[PDB]
Design a protein around this nucleic acid. Sequence first.
DNA 1: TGGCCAAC
DNA 2: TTGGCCA
DNA 3: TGGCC
DNA 4: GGCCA
DNA 5: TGGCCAAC
DNA 6: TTGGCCA
DNA 7: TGGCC
DNA 8: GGCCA
Lengths: 269, 269, 269, 269
Amino acid sequence: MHQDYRELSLDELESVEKQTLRTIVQALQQYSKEAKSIFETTAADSSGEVIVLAEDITQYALEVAETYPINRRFAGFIDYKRVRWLPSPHGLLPQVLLVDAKASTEKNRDTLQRSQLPMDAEFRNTSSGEVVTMEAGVIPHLMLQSANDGVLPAVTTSIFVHFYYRELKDVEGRYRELKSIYVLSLPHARLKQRYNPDPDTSFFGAGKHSPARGEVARIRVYFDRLKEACPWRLQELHYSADSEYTQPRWRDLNDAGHEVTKEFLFLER
Amino acid sequence: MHQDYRELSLDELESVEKQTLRTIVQALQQYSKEAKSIFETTAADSSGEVIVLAEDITQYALEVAETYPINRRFAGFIDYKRVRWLPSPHGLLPQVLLVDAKASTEKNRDTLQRSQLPMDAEFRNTSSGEVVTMEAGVIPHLMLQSANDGVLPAVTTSIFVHFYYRELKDVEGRYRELKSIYVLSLPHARLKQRYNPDPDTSFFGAGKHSPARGEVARIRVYFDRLKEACPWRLQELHYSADSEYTQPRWRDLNDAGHEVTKEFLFLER
Amino acid sequence: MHQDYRELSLDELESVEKQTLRTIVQALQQYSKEAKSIFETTAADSSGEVIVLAEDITQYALEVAETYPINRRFAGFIDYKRVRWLPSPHGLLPQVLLVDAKASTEKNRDTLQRSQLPMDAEFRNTSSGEVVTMEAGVIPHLMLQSANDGVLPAVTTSIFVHFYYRELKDVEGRYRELKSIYVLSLPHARLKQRYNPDPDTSFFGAGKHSPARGEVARIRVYFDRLKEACPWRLQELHYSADSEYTQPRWRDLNDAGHEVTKEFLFLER
Amino acid sequence: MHQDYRELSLDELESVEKQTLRTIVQALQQYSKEAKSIFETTAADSSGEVIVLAEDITQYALEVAETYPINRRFAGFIDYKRVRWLPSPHGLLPQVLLVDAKASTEKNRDTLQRSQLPMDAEFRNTSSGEVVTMEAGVIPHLMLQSANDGVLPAVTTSIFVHFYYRELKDVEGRYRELKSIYVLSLPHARLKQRYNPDPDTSFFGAGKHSPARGEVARIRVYFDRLKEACPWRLQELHYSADSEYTQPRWRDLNDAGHEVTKEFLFLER
DNA sequence: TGGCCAAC
DNA sequence: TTGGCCA
DNA sequence: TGGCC
DNA sequence: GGCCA
DNA sequence: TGGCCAAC
DNA sequence: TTGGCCA
DNA sequence: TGGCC
DNA sequence: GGCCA
Ligand SMILES: [Ca+2]
Ligand SMILES: [Ca+2]
Ligand SMILES: [Ca+2]
Ligand SMILES: [Ca+2]
């Protein structure tokens, strides 16, 4: 086994992330009933609410699905974060789970600060035709001080929880409608060559703000382009009208390479 | 990626047991210092005090290294037990962790009531020369009620924390010496053929019970055989004089199959 | 507002014990349903199974109702134990909660090893007619190392969860009936004069031990006397047929001093 | 005892709040060493950081000093919040602990949204000479659904953690300096007549933004005016240069009415 | 109640 | 290892 | 203390 | 939640 | 090892 | 109630 | 998909 | 994180 992720094959590393996301999708799924009641029937306080409501729900849902805590903390801008040990066949890996909640009226892509970017981005602006850039503001790991030695790198695992919804303003006791909770597992920096080797191959899009062409502040991530590069990295728990809880569907791919989506079992929580 | 353990290949099942052990071994290691202090300096009361010190030190070391808790509890003679979700590449598997603490003066073998026996056992009693047979008393899985369908089987994982020590003529604040902590990982039933195909092929042995006095019968497991059966299923956190913590050693079985050992990193806790 | 319990008036000390009991009573109440299910339907193994079911059900009910944890653990024959901070008007007091579980067939009195005895006891053995004397085996407080000075005494609070039941001829999935749960709050030493000033004035009595066979000696406490000594120190969660939960009753002693009982509210858990 | 705060005398209610704050001051004090290292040596990310860093530290400090959790949650704008049972001599009270972190360059007063206002405010604008108003956006309680009945009111307890600091921009590995962590316990709505009976008696000040005279959006709270109306409601843990941790000082008043400040004991945490 | 004996 | 059962 | 940006 | 009156 | 007897 | 001690 | 407010 | 091209 290994204690240093850097001693892991890109594939093995990928499983850590895959492994981390599946757990997270269980927590959300099992929190869906309540997630929806809170998201929809919480006060209005003049817009902005949803921003909070998202991070709030994402935490009330994941804090109960955690693992072996590590005695190290850090303040950052990512609405949710826990340093911990993550049991794995590749070895008990020290990990830093970073996850940010988002609320949007859109169902494809979402914006992010340099401080949320797992890897160095580089895409090509449609109109412009020129290359845009953004260094990653998120570290690859957080060195931990061994007791029997020195620093041990706790890997950084990035996850995004997008709450796609629609305004309704306010009916009886409902002010809006949660439609689906999308979940994304953004690949680690070490995996750059795979998901973003050059500007003509990448799930990153044009920022949303004044500047365009060359280096930029903001950026985007398009769900479709990510899924196509790897199906399990785009999870989606959708609310039909048959269940109070979302539709427990998990996207992956069989051992023939065909992307498949299966329905899993969840508990009352 | 599998929720039902039965859908797992045999090697994989092994894998969740091994990642389960590695996590417990770590939890113990990071507590071995306090473990020593509590085990050697705790005042003996009506003797048999080694009993409860083993149970207690075990709970404390592990209760801090748990994972995604599932809302189901047990009530039995098992020392430490928790139902929960165990994340892993093979899927987020529901699991009943069963750890039994043992205060022992012998660094070889270990005793088991039948309710602690994972698989159906069969061995050849040397003294008598015959053949002994014990039926596993531990359920393969505990069924959970699915919030959205059938029942979900919770794998049963058996671990044994064996505290090797020796009494001592009180000197300092010490009353006895904790030589080392052995952590055993007994294989789940589905593995029966790989570890106990026939009577002569097993790691079991005569039980510490007295048939003459007509006692119900128990069975034993012998570290040496167990280790040969599978290196990682027998771990030993040995206390030395270099540090106050057990020496951080973990044995695995080389990429090619030969037994190997390594020193690992651990945090102060 | 006081950190050292010794600086507390006698009435106040009582107060932290009573608020400690009320919290445990609630924790139990909200678990009485599962408590019943586990206690009556759990398959008997080598009998004496009522023992571990009492311990287990107790831990589960209370382990969920704790407070500000302090970084210090015990190792002894006490069933449930946690060092911690207990908030209150009288100050944030450090405290060693000591709860012992008992599986009993009698709704009167309760047995105590000496290591469970809070104060020095003295009573008048009726059969012999003489006078019996037992020295408390429970420390008044556990000293903690101050990060900024001296040591800080952690009050010792003794609670007893007594499970009253009767065996039964297996019928449904039932093997025995849990009639009710009695929760006792024994007073801390500093209260000795108020509860056991002289031998004839006490709530103790002969111990369940056999002196003839030369057994070490234990002592008993008799609910009836205890209750008269102080109403709230004896609580009873009785199981009825109206609901699956114990009937939510809590007895206190009226503003003027007369005993009073009330039905309280509890959550589903 | 009582389960409904509304059955409590304003004084008793005040003790709940007093009791809640003292615990919180212990958590912060015991987190001071780390609180400071994080606050000061965390990245710059171009201002705003401190805003986050404050709530972050306030949570890493308090989440470990919690009590008996209640199975109810709610998303709001207050950076920290937990519904729970709070042991008290007045009875086990269901409580909703609301606490907001703030970071400021000032050491007196701090701004707040209607959504952070515990009680209806009303002061008199200096210049203007006219009365200003603001309804309280924070509810007095959150009804909980009894299992054996109906709604049970979980009291709302408001607390403010102001991290007074000073910019330094960036030296070696320090970018700013935390000087003191002030803590405030804002009185419940039921206590309005006491701390704010009319506009000429109140710790509230003029908002900070365009509008002035008559009803307003924002508002202020001046530490001095609050302390003078009640000494324990203004706690301050200050960093001198003798200790890594703040100066463990608690402000209260003896049972002669003289405000006194004492030094308490804290653990390593 | 008090105490013996029991299978833990 | 704490507890039933007996007088 | 105020309200401004 | 800065800066300045 | 295997098994008895022990004080839990 | 699980474990020491003995051959 | 882009950048605008 | 809205709105619109
Ligand atoms: Ca966000
Ligand atoms: Ca055991
Ligand atoms: Ca007990
Ligand atoms: Ca704030």
